Write a protein that holds these residues in place. Structure first.
Motif, PDB file in Angstrom:
ATOM      1  N   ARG A 199       7.807 -18.586   2.246  1.00 52.58           N
ATOM      2  CA  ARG A 199       6.360 -18.515   2.132  1.00 52.58           C
ATOM      3  C   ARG A 199       5.951 -17.049   1.983  1.00 52.58           C
ATOM      4  O   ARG A 199       6.601 -16.157   2.539  1.00 52.58           O
ATOM      5  N   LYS A 200       4.901 -16.811   1.201  1.00 49.44           N
ATOM      6  CA  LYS A 200       4.405 -15.470   0.974  1.00 49.44           C
ATOM      7  C   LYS A 200       4.167 -14.740   2.301  1.00 49.44           C
ATOM      8  O   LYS A 200       4.660 -13.634   2.507  1.00 49.44           O
ATOM      9  N   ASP A 201       3.423 -15.371   3.201  1.00 53.95           N
ATOM     10  CA  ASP A 201       3.035 -14.705   4.441  1.00 53.95           C
ATOM     11  C   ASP A 201       4.218 -14.549   5.378  1.00 53.95           C
ATOM     12  O   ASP A 201       4.213 -13.687   6.250  1.00 53.95           O
ATOM     13  N   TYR A 202       5.237 -15.379   5.201  1.00 52.36           N
ATOM     14  CA  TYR A 202       6.417 -15.284   6.049  1.00 52.36           C
ATOM     15  C   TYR A 202       7.235 -14.055   5.648  1.00 52.36           C
ATOM     16  O   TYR A 202       7.703 -13.300   6.499  1.00 52.36           O
ATOM     17  N   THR A 203       7.375 -13.828   4.351  1.00 52.04           N
ATOM     18  CA  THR A 203       8.063 -12.625   3.875  1.00 52.04           C
ATOM     19  C   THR A 203       7.325 -11.363   4.328  1.00 52.04           C
ATOM     20  O   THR A 203       7.941 -10.412   4.822  1.00 52.04           O
ATOM     21  N   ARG A 204       6.003 -11.376   4.178  1.00 48.73           N
ATOM     22  CA  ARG A 204       5.151 -10.278   4.624  1.00 48.73           C
ATOM     23  C   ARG A 204       5.352  -9.999   6.105  1.00 48.73           C
ATOM     24  O   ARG A 204       5.461  -8.843   6.513  1.00 48.73           O
ATOM     25  N   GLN A 205       5.420 -11.054   6.906  1.00 50.80           N
ATOM     26  CA  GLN A 205       5.599 -10.895   8.346  1.00 50.80           C
ATOM     27  C   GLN A 205       6.966 -10.286   8.669  1.00 50.80           C
ATOM     28  O   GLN A 205       7.071  -9.407   9.532  1.00 50.80           O
ATOM     29  N   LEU A 206       8.004 -10.749   7.971  1.00 46.72           N
ATOM     30  CA  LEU A 206       9.364 -10.235   8.157  1.00 46.72           C
ATOM     31  C   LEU A 206       9.420  -8.748   7.890  1.00 46.72           C
ATOM     32  O   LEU A 206       9.987  -7.983   8.673  1.00 46.72           O
ATOM     33  N   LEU A 207       8.825  -8.343   6.776  1.00 45.42           N
ATOM     34  CA  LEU A 207       8.806  -6.937   6.409  1.00 45.42           C
ATOM     35  C   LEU A 207       8.082  -6.094   7.480  1.00 45.42           C
ATOM     36  O   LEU A 207       8.584  -5.045   7.901  1.00 45.42           O
ATOM     37  N   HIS A 208       6.921  -6.569   7.931  1.00 46.33           N
ATOM     38  CA  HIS A 208       6.190  -5.934   9.028  1.00 46.33           C
ATOM     39  C   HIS A 208       7.013  -5.820  10.306  1.00 46.33           C
ATOM     40  O   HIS A 208       6.934  -4.816  11.009  1.00 46.33           O
ATOM     41  N   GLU A 209       7.805  -6.844  10.609  1.00 48.35           N
ATOM     42  CA  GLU A 209       8.505  -6.878  11.889  1.00 48.35           C
ATOM     43  C   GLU A 209       9.695  -5.914  11.953  1.00 48.35           C
ATOM     44  O   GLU A 209      10.036  -5.435  13.038  1.00 48.35           O
ATOM     45  N   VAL A 210      10.325  -5.610  10.817  1.00 47.80           N
ATOM     46  CA  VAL A 210      11.456  -4.687  10.866  1.00 47.80           C
ATOM     47  C   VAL A 210      11.028  -3.224  10.758  1.00 47.80           C
ATOM     48  O   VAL A 210      11.882  -2.336  10.793  1.00 47.80           O
ATOM     49  N   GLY A 211       9.726  -2.977  10.607  1.00 47.32           N
ATOM     50  CA  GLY A 211       9.208  -1.617  10.618  1.00 47.32           C
ATOM     51  C   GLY A 211       8.349  -1.125   9.462  1.00 47.32           C
ATOM     52  O   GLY A 211       7.814  -0.026   9.541  1.00 47.32           O
ATOM     53  N   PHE A 212       8.216  -1.901   8.388  1.00 47.33           N
ATOM     54  CA  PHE A 212       7.433  -1.456   7.227  1.00 47.33           C
ATOM     55  C   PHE A 212       5.932  -1.380   7.539  1.00 47.33           C
ATOM     56  O   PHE A 212       5.344  -2.343   8.014  1.00 47.33           O
ATOM     57  N   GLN A 213       5.312  -0.242   7.249  1.00 48.78           N
ATOM     58  CA  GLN A 213       3.962   0.034   7.741  1.00 48.78           C
ATOM     59  C   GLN A 213       2.846  -0.576   6.890  1.00 48.78           C
ATOM     60  O   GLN A 213       1.785  -0.916   7.409  1.00 48.78           O
ATOM     61  N   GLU A 214       3.084  -0.727   5.596  1.00 45.24           N
ATOM     62  CA  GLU A 214       2.024  -1.113   4.668  1.00 45.24           C
ATOM     63  C   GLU A 214       2.589  -1.980   3.558  1.00 45.24           C
ATOM     64  O   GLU A 214       3.501  -1.567   2.843  1.00 45.24           O
ATOM     65  N   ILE A 215       2.056  -3.185   3.409  1.00 45.59           N
ATOM     66  CA  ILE A 215       2.603  -4.109   2.430  1.00 45.59           C
ATOM     67  C   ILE A 215       1.554  -4.656   1.479  1.00 45.59           C
ATOM     68  O   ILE A 215       0.617  -5.333   1.901  1.00 45.59           O
ATOM     69  N   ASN A 216       1.729  -4.387   0.190  1.00 41.01           N
ATOM     70  CA  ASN A 216       0.863  -4.979  -0.809  1.00 41.01           C
ATOM     71  C   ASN A 216       1.614  -6.026  -1.625  1.00 41.01           C
ATOM     72  O   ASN A 216       2.645  -5.734  -2.233  1.00 41.01           O
ATOM     73  N   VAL A 236       5.302  -4.953  -2.329  1.00 39.53           N
ATOM     74  CA  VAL A 236       5.416  -3.502  -2.395  1.00 39.53           C
ATOM     75  C   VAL A 236       5.270  -2.995  -0.968  1.00 39.53           C
ATOM     76  O   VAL A 236       4.162  -2.863  -0.458  1.00 39.53           O
ATOM     77  N   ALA A 237       6.394  -2.751  -0.307  1.00 34.79           N
ATOM     78  CA  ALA A 237       6.360  -2.401   1.108  1.00 34.79           C
ATOM     79  C   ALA A 237       6.692  -0.930   1.328  1.00 34.79           C
ATOM     80  O   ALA A 237       7.808  -0.481   1.053  1.00 34.79           O
ATOM     81  N   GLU A 238       5.710  -0.184   1.817  1.00 35.87           N
ATOM     82  CA  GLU A 238       5.891   1.233   2.098  1.00 35.87           C
ATOM     83  C   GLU A 238       6.436   1.444   3.489  1.00 35.87           C
ATOM     84  O   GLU A 238       5.891   0.925   4.458  1.00 35.87           O
ATOM     85  N   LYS A 239       7.516   2.207   3.583  1.00 37.99           N
ATOM     86  CA  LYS A 239       8.067   2.592   4.875  1.00 37.99           C
ATOM     87  C   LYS A 239       7.003   3.371   5.641  1.00 37.99           C
ATOM     88  O   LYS A 239       6.937   3.295   6.872  1.00 37.99           O
ATOM     89  N   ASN A 240       6.173   4.105   4.894  1.00 34.94           N
ATOM     90  CA  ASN A 240       4.939   4.710   5.415  1.00 34.94           C
ATOM     91  C   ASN A 240       3.851   4.822   4.348  1.00 34.94           C
ATOM     92  O   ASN A 240       2.657   4.831   4.658  1.00 34.94           O
TER      93      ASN A 240
END
Ligand SMILES: C[S@@+](CC[C@H](N)C(=O)[O-])C[C@H]1O[C@@H](n2cnc3c(N)ncnc32)[C@H](O)[C@@H]1O
Length: 240
Positions: A199-216, A236-240
């Motif tokens: 799911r879109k929001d599940y991938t977004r959540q995963l990325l957020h949980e391992v440390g990625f600060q900003e996700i478009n 598009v996940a920015e480490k910062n």
């Protein structure tokens, strides 16, 4: 294993029938432009497959390292790059322990072509994403795409076509833990593949949980016959 040989037959058929020029036309310059706007120089491709993304990045003037878990894929990638006049730099590496044989950090990582979907375990997904996160410079960026599984899970039961009518992708079976697609090529060839329906929001959540600060997350309409919903998403996940 047969599963390796099966998938290798699949990518051979893909490359046989689908021209990289055609594909490069279809895919925008969006990803290249996104990287250029960030002043990206060093790129790590962690899902090289037969090399299309890597070669596109090399042609664009990026410094590219081309990784893949499969030695056989990498051989196909190297020879495809060679044919387009580029020296590929290949590294065999599993996503779950990427820093085993990769000893540098990168401005960007690309995980394209609906690749991340091939992990069926959540622990593996977190691991893969943490490895990617550690391979990025402080101001680095992860580009990760996936099919739009939300559209299928909520409704959607028809074929999707790519590069004109050269291949159709049909959802044979989709539940929350498994999507099985039938791929049918213009020459009659049929392949069936399993992947995990992120799911879109599940991938977004995963990325957020391992440390990625900003996700478009961008909607990406790749298919030949456009619908109201994009068939792909690009994170598009920015480490910062
Ligand atoms: C769908 S192909 C993508 C090819 C390419 N990115 C493209 O768009 O043409 C996915 C690739 O990911 C690789 N792969 C799958 N799981 C992996 C893992 N756990 N570690 C490293 N590579 C993996 C496979 O070997 C395969 O070549």
């Amino acid at each position: 294993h047969y599963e390796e040989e099966y998938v290798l037959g699949f990518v051979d058929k893909w490359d046989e029938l689908i021209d990289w020029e055609s594909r490069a036309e279809s895919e925008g310059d969006t990803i290249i432009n996104i990287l250029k706007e960030r002043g990206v120089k060093k790129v790590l491709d962690v899902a090289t497959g037969t090399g299309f993304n890597s070669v596109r990045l090399l042609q664009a003037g990026f410094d590219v390292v081309s990784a893949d878990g499969s030695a056989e894929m990498l051989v196909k990638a190297f020879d495809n790059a060679r044919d387009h006049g580029y020296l590929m730099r290949t590294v065999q590496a599993d996503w779950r322990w990427m820093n085993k044989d990769i000893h540098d950090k990168f401005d960007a990582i690309v995980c394209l072509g609906n690749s991340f979907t091939h992990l069926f375990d959540e622990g593996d997904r977190r691991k893969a994403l943490a490895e990617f996160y550690a391979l990025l410079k402080h101001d680095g960026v992860l580009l990760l795409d996936q099919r739009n599984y939300d559209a299928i899970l909520d409704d959607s039961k028809h074929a999707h076509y790519y590069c004109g009518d050269t291949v159709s992708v049909y959802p044979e079976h989709v539940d929350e833990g498994l999507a099985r697609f039938k791929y049918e090529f213009s020459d009659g060839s049929v392949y069936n593949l399993n992947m995990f329906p992120l799911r879109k929001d599940y991938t977004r959540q995963l990325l957020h949980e391992v440390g990625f600060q900003e996700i478009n997350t961008l909607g990406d309409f790749k298919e030949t016959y456009k619908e109201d919903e994009p068939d792909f998403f690009l994170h598009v996940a920015e480490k910062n």
